Amino acid sequence: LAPRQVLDLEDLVFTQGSHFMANKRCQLPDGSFRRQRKGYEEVHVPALKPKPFGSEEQLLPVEKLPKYAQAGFEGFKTLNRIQSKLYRAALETDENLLLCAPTGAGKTNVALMCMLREIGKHINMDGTINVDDFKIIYIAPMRSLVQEMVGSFGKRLATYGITVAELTGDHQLCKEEISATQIIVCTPEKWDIITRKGGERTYTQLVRLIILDEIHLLHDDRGPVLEALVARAIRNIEMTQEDVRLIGLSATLPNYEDVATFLRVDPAKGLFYFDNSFRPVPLEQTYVGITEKKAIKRFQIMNEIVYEKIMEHAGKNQVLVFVHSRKETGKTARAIRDMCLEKDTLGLFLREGSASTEVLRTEAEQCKNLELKDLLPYGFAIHHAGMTRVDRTLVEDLFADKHIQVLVSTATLAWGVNLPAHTVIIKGTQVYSPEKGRWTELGALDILQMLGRAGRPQYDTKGEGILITSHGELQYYLSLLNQQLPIESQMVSKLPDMLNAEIVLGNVQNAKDAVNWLGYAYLYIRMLRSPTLYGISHDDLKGDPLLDQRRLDLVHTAALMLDKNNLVKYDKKTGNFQVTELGRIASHYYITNDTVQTYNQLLKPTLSEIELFRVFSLSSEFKNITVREEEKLELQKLLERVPIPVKESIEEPSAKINVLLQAFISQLKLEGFALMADMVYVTQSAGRLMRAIFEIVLNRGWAQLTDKTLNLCKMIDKRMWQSMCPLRQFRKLPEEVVKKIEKKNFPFERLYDLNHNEIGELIRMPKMGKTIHKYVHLFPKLELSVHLQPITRSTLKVELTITPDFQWDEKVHGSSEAFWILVEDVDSEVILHHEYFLLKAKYAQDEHLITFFVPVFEPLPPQYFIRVVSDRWLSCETQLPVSFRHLILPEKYPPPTELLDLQPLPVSALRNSAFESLYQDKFPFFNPIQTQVFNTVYNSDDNVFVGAPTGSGKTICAEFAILRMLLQSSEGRCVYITPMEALAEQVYMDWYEKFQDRLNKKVVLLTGETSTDLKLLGKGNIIISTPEKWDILSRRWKQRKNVQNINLFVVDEVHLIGGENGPVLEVICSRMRYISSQIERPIRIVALSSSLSNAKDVAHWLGCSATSTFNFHPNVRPVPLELHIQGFNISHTQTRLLSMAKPVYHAITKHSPKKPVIVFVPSRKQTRLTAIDILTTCAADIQRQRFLHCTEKDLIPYLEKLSDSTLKETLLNGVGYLHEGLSPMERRLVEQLFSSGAIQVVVASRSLCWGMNVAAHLVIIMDTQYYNGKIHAYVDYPIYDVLQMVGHANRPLQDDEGRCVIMCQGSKKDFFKKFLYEPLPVESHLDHCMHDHFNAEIVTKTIENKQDAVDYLTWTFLYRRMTQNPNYYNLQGISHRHLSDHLSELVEQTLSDLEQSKCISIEDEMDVAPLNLGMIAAYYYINYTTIELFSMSLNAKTKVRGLIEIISNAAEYENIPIRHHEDNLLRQLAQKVPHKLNNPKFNDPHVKTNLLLQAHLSRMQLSAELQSDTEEILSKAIRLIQACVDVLSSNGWLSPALAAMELAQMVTQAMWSKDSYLKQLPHFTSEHIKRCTDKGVESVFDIMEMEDEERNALLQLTDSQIADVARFCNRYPNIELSYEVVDKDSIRSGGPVVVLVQLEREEEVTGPVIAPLFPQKREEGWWVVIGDAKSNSLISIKRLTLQQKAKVKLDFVAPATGAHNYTLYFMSDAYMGCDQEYKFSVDV
Amino acid sequence: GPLGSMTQTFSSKTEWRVRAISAANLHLRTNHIYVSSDDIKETGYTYILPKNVLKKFICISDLRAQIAGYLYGVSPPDNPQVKEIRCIVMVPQWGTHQTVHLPGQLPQHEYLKEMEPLGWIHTQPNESPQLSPQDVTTHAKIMADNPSWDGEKTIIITCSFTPGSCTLTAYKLTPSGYEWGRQNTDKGNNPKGYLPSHYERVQMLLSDRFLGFFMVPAQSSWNYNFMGVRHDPNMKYELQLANPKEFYHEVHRPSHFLNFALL
């Protein structure tokens, strides 16, 4: 490690790339012979003889294939020879394979067989393929090949419903085409850049099979891409331990065994070598090596040789000639035809008076192509890329039927079209390479492919290939085409860029990772097998047999290179690599490392277009470009005419590159051949180079340069300057009309104001005014407005509204349009904020709301600017000036309350031995804050406010107030609200121990069940609740005495009124205040909070005196907090988390080497990743187990109870983790190991920051954003979560201080400093959550008119904050009139929405009254929109399935967005479940609820996190169902209401209607059901009546299991039902009909319903129903809760004398099979 | 004697390219701005130019063709002898090295209605001991056509390109200067009647305490030095609250980009 050497990589490079010839000698096949001619040599190699089969060789007919595979071989009778040798290995094993065969032997069909095996892995019994359960990658080297593969594979696999596709390259939102596709076909470079980006995505885990076609490309300068791909795949497999199949396809060339080692191919099982005899058509080869050195003579010699060779086939055989330009195709066809005319031989191609000429007569005369015009009648044709598609298909269809006699073409035909010719001539092997700047030899892949096109597979008995080259290259080509050109590795030059890609991905974090990575490269295998070829002596190898030292040196050299160019920071001692944003950009945009150093050195916020074009022209991708004298004239002409001035001289290549780019944008055609090819190369690179520049300067905040570079990207992509009419971006418009429009020299925006008539008039062309008008409004255009919401005097929240102002047309806008939002300062020089904004087609008409923060200062600056700029369209931008002239900044916040230096308060101060026993053991003194508040809380009844950081022990203050209550009366009721359920449960544990166990009071925890919670409110002296569970209770405070007689109301964490669920908390607090003011018996309020800047507003809202308002600020925290906010420059989330990996470890060792540490991470996956990473760093620090503080063997009995193996491994080394996916017992094990001091570090997810019973000395917050999968975007941690996390760094009895390291993106550092070092401003958002509360308060008759609603608002925190911060609430002033109008408008809008929903009635535009719909919404705590949807959908005959669906689509079910993978599972659920749903659209949020409900009802299985989600769904289900029951019975319908009650039953018990009523019993599987049906009836009373002898003989169960069964049978409802009709003797038509039903339960049963598959404990609910099923009418419904006995009365009107069969129904919401019916009749 | 021996061809050159390269470097001067305010005058009106808009005005200019912007401001609440420049307005204009040509119409926009016209600022190739007679004539003719321009209150700021730097001087007209300038037709460097008693220097301070802002045309840009014929003294224009584009920006010279496309 220590004595490294720095190598020269360029001296190790094979400069000839794929033309490097490693073999010293070439052995020609037998029968070859060498002939001489004037100026050239010929070498003839005869066709090979096929090997005539073998000992066990038979061609496999498709019949014998596996049956799922035969569909892929439809239309074929039998596999060929090589497929028949390969089918067992390819279709019946998962073995990695390498297949070496000559071109056209059938390698791609073997790849098809491998594809078919993978496809078979995912076939259901329904026949279809789980198309969303796998992906396959086919890597083809050339784009035309990719496209042909897409077509042919798609046709072969259509019968499977499998999509094959190529990738566009945009991937704006086009990674969607990755998820749509099962078989991705792309080039190596494309798959490389995609997997370089390596963000968290499903495609990576879906990949099961990778096919590397033409893998001998390894020998080419592009080969290192294949090596990077393979090394990355194999290391991903190591990390994931999931196996991926690798299949390599190559020509037959030496080192195929090394390629095999490189693909992890077992040579015995997976290596197959087929020599060149296995070519389908035998190949007679001719090589012509010209000795002439002079160009002028050599060119005509070549034309002569091709003429003589053509004549050997004219009339007898077709000839495909191959040329390396688009111009030289026609040029050589003309040369040949001229030589034929001069020698009168032209008649040998065209038979005199034969059929072919006839077909040639028409098309040739049509002259669709000009060169085709000159050539086609004579039998000649050319074919290249610049031609039209239909002309190419013309040439192809003519050649197929043997009509064309000589076809001159390029490599593109050889790769992209299946066109075989009997004779193939390759005219020259020189091609101009712009990347190299000179002429070079043809690539080997091109040669092999072209000569593979020689000999037609069916018609020809042999093929004839004629390669013409220079004499010195004969040995080379002879080698390549005769199995002797060895495949070497070219990657030693590319090593820095490749290593940086792995560093950016985090796969390589240090030099040992890099060495291991390089051990997977093909270069490494080649170095092992031929060291001297790679600059390693054989004694060097013997002294270093695994080449450890050599790889260390190579890695060291590359790392030094990358570090010199600032892509990486390389610590030589540790070997450690630190990623940088510049390195990330170089990798993600496929830029070489020298180019990124150049950009970093030359880019500056002051650059103009001049220096920007120059910077671009200096890219290292262009380092070989030169300015030739023959070019210098043409270039000079362009140099003084280019619109962007060029500073440097024409002598400098940078000026030529600059001018070429500008000529390209101006769409100028040039004359020099080198100039055209150089332009193509430059401008093909320009797009992604300039996007890299754009991302650089954008992330630095450089406003002007960001504008210029995004514009330059778009000018390159659209090939036009800004000045041009933006309308020419519509390629359907004529050029002459837009030339007219530019000639009229008027602002393009003016066209918006005009109609089609004026548009026709401005351009002197009326005939077009309509279409132009259309296009003017197809052009993307966005309207912007702001709402400025001040937060402090220096922080401003901005809500930007984006309204689309254009017509969407998918032919023009595709599926989405992308924009950049840029908030820029006064001078338009600093980007204060930016973000990507995607306008999806489905939302092309809606307003989009964006919100962000920006700093402001005093004196306020004139304005900011918001620009919204298209990512693709030139001249497509909207800028909104954001003036601050009328901004009303809130008041500076007041000073905090002085923390007084008081004598610490003993527990003795409680002066009650029983009270003092609560805290006597724990400590002797209360902290300074408790000391300061004690007198007010314990010795007064004043409303009190205590604001202090988390960790100040405000809970003890609430306890002081509770103990005062307990001294004032023993029957006192304290209600305690906290905003989170996990906090509520932790407090329930603590206060149960304190007040119930030690003080004999009653402590209860509300659940959600209104009956349960009302009983608890009755019992309890301490009632703990979350805000909504108390909302539903306290809504009916006028009817419930226990809500009013509250002595003490404590609300904790009240600053959370500013947060997402704050309105409910604000509402219940305001209601408690108003109740206190009404009942003339004051309810004492105690409010605990984080430090608030606007504490006085909260205190006054809750009625706290100033002397009773303790407003402390963060500095007063009893355990001092050292906070370090560390900013991270990287804008790509995964890379930034990587850059935080090591700082996490360094922070532990600096701030807390021995004391416990919590690390919060954004995601569940990150918990484990970071635990492992901390352990890896601990190990490489040779401090491997520093975080284990107990004995291993003392810990292993703990470890046995875990089911997570990696968690056990990490715990063994002293590091735990915690995420939602662990079972609660696992969480508790980890928590107690952490609190006991056993393990020192625990890594928890953000989701768990409210329910962790664990504290630490150091808290590290690793990043402050998390991915929301609903909206597919990163979301900032709410400040409230951050405060809670920081609060975990506080151990009052253990540490002298707490420490916290917040690692965040740099953009947010200052924000955190402002809102963590200072106290927090909080605001109301009740004005956005108004309706449900207005509805409730109209139902309870608190609001009876609009004035009542204004007066009610006056009780809220919202109302108080409206005068302190008017702009935040969109008020313009604070005059009493201003806020009177504002409250009136809010009231008017809310009551209008309610009345439209038919929840309330509005009479005389003043009086409001509850409708039954509103009464139901309020009774069950249902969103008024949910109840409206219900009222629409239900009517009188919808299926139980429709009930499930409408219930799933209810506002209450938009919560958990974790899963998009399980969607297909739900698809296959729809077949299993009885729910045959119409309109089977599948998505992310509410349908997850629908079929998760389905999973519950049929008792299907689910995952852990999915299970925690099921519980919430079931928490809302019963209320929604009861609302449905309540609407149906009110309307009078009898059948649908009974069906809804049975649905309540099915949800409680997790069964179905027709299912066995024995499935409610414990341990009762279907076999018990078939047994109980044999000589039995399915009833649980049946079970009860038999004696346990026969019972157990049937049930086949354990004794404890039958004890559970009997517990159920005793809790199953058994009741006495009695029906009577009062005054039945005298009934008269009209009102008086009274039915009296008496019910009596026998056993006075106690305890709740037994429903183990239902989460919350329920109480037995009953419905008494009188109706008639004949009429579908319900007359008398009453809901009942039955105790030991109860009597129910029901009223009904008797219309007329008539029929009277009446159906008394007794129905349950909890149990299936207890419904009783009694029928009778009596007339009026 | 060329005879038939020596023949060379003319490769074109163009002045605006050299000037454009030059204009790219104007940002260097913004770190080195000097006010030539060591003058005999004491108090009078005191003008405060915020540095941000002055730097921007320098960066959008040309080293040969003068450009000009209109000045708008107010007095600090309880100090009426001090005028704070709060806004510069760029209007359709074209210049030479000696003068600028602005429309007859003065800036009109509700966003300036609470402000006070304070005169104008313009760049100049070289420092000069005295105020140009072109400037005297320009300011006087603007005063005669616009009574809102008070002779005791409107000024001419010259921003002169000293080597490596910018030097500012601020002047005001005298009543004699006004009367002479409103009747002057001689555009030359020494018109008959021109006197140094026609102007006086006023006090001027650069400040970082507050920020100015810009207003620019609504339906075009401000630079017409490449579209001279499109310009007319009687042209009308509206304004918007936005920052102006540099002199050699593409929208100011569309013909260059449209005519390079013609080879």
Ligand SMILES: CON(C)S(=O)(=O)c1ccccc1
């Ligand atoms: C280079 O990386 N790829 C080829 S990959 O498709 O993403 C992948 C993913 C998992 C396992 C193996 C490979």
